[PDB]
């Protein structure tokens, strides 16, 4: 119960799960959701439909705090990013700006064998 009425929406989309964190304009979170907060347990979380459900659930939780407009921030390349985008877009929440802010290094650390053949 804070009545923020305007904040940010971070989307963390990986190939294994999509998780949505709704925060205030300073970044402090309010509510959140993910594929695991919905009934989906295993690989079904890395599904665009699961991402849609997570986005809609986080949006409905933010409705309790009476929030209307959000600023969307996307991080990570994963199946279900655009589906969460389109879920938040038409959810009653006014989407003011969508921004991709995926953290890309300047070739700092050595990846795992899974991500090798690169630097």
């Amino acid at each position: 119960k804070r009545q923020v009425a305007s904040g940010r929406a971070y989307i963390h989309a990986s190939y294994n799960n999509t998780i949505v964190t709704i925060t205030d304009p300073d970044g402090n979170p309010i509510t959140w959701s993910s594929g695991g907060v919905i009934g989906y347990k295993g690989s079904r979380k890395g599904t665009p439909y699961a991402a849609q459900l997570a986005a809609l659930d986080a949006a409905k939780k933010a409705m309790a705090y009476g929030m209307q407009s959000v600023d969307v921030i996307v991080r990570g390349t994963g199946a279900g990013r655009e589906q969460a985008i389109r879920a938040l877009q038409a959810s009653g929440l006014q989407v003011k700006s969508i921004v991709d802010d995926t953290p890309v290094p300047h070739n700092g650390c050595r990846p795992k064998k899974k991500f090798r053949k690169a630097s």
């Binding site: 996307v74 700006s97 969508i98 921004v99 991709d100 802010d101 890309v104």
Partner: protein
């Protein structure tokens, strides 16, 4: 094929070694803080090579960005 406009052709007389001229080096960066390739800038090999180091200097001085964020995705 980058048929919109060349940065050099959309510009006049300028110094390629001036790391303090921010408003002219801003044109040579993309929407992100990244340095534009040759197909976008329309510079020569030597020109682009000098531009790279001058942009890096302008970045270290705090004038140009190392990286920006993408909007309207």
């Amino acid at each position: 094929p980058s048929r919109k406009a060349k940065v050099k052709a959309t510009l006049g007389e300028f110094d390629l070694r001036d790391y303090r001229n921010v408003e002219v080096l801003k044109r040579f960066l993309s929407e992100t803080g990244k340095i534009l390739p040759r197909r976008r800038t329309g510079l020569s090999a030597k020109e682009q090579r000098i531009l790279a180091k001058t942009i890096k200097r302008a970045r270290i001085l705090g004038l140009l960005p190392f990286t920006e964020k993408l909007v309207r995705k």
